[PDB]
Amino acid sequence: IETPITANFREGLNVLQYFISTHGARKGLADTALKTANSGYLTRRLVDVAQDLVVTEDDCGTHEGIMMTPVIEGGDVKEPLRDRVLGRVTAEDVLKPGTADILVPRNTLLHEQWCDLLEENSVDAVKVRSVVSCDTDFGVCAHCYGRDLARGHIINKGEAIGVIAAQSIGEPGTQLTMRSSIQVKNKGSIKLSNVKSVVNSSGKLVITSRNTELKLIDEFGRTKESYKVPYGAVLAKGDGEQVAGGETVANWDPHTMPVITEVSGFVRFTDMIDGQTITRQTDELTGL
């Protein structure tokens, strides 16, 4: 509503302002009193899909597990690696970021002391054991689950993890709601992934691949920023380069899909006939 409620509660609200306030608050009470049914039915579906899964071994005997990286949406690094790899047992032994060192062994639980020795060495990402990669028939082994979470140690042989997991996902169901180009922020080094590129005539490295990931790696080794750069964008920078904080490093036009080339030469109209294939629309306000 274009006219706000300029009066607080210490000054008096008049009539219209309180009525607009009642719009805004009746919507919230209706949302909670109807949201609670979906939250409870979500907890029911979750504890009946889980329902069976019991910690029933001590090691499945595998070497597979998901690759825990810190998550980065495009702003500053949102959830650090110490939040994701706290108390989860590594899959293979993490190499120290210098060269080929056995920093941690390959079946160690990562409690707070190990995670601090991970944060000192600025470890990139940890290949850690996940429950979906567990090889145990009819249950989850004790290492592929992780830390007990309300006990400091590993999960005991027996403790029902499906039900506590289903409750822990569905329990915050009440608090949840129901109803141009790239500008860098920090100052570091450039790295490109999924890139197949070419240098244009002016010098800005344009990209012949749609799915290119533009990472900003710091001077230490960890990945601090990530972005998605489209097919055919004007990169102000290049691979492995050092930039300044706030300098624009990418540019494109999303309303005009570029059909840029790899080589040079002359242009011919192959199967382009005016009258059937293409049409003649001379511009009104420009003339070109």
């Binding site: 907890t43 979470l149 309300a150 006990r151 506590i164 409750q167 329990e171």
Partner: protein, 251 residues
Amino acid sequence: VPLDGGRFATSDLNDLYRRVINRNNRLKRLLDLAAPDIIVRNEKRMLQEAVDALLDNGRRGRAITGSNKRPLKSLADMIKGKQGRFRQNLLGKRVDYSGRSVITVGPYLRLHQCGLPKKMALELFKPFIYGKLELRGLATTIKAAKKMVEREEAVVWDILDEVIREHPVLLNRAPTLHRLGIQAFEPVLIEGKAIQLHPLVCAAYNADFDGDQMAVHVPLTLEAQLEARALMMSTNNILSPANGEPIIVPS
């Protein structure tokens, strides 16, 4: 069973079975009498629809009804639904040795103990008090003990403080969402009629004190007392199982 009065409040299945038997008797009599084809086709069709209405009512076209327009409840409707046997009597049951009252604060408590009223304590612990009274030798038969606690003499409160002492109880707030909503305490007896609940523990139950109610349950057997002390005690739940964050945070 009859309700309070002189008539029998009959179940719906008796209507269903009585109709199937009425129709089956009619069909046997018509096959005795050699009625023509269309009569016994309607008779067997009414029996088919009667059996199909008995088993799963309303899966066929519009369900039959006795009183008044509401359809009557069949066997499959004794199984299925929110109020069948699974979701209403086998997964969740009503429970003896249990109680319920309004909560209040009582901040003098240590966080392994909760306040529990004397009237609820003498009602929930009637068999332990009976066993204690029969051990001392104050009475003889069970009747005498039930008269003693029906009168509430001066000697059963010492018996009650000697059955409480190291015996945990399960406090439970009514919308239990995660496992920290059932926690086991040790009772401390309360002159009053309200459960005194230690304040830090409230942030686990999502329990404010604006009119809330909680249920108490008594672990009867010995393995259940040990599970209440060793797994479900309130000192043992100081970290939320969803993460690593402490749940006994000062509110």
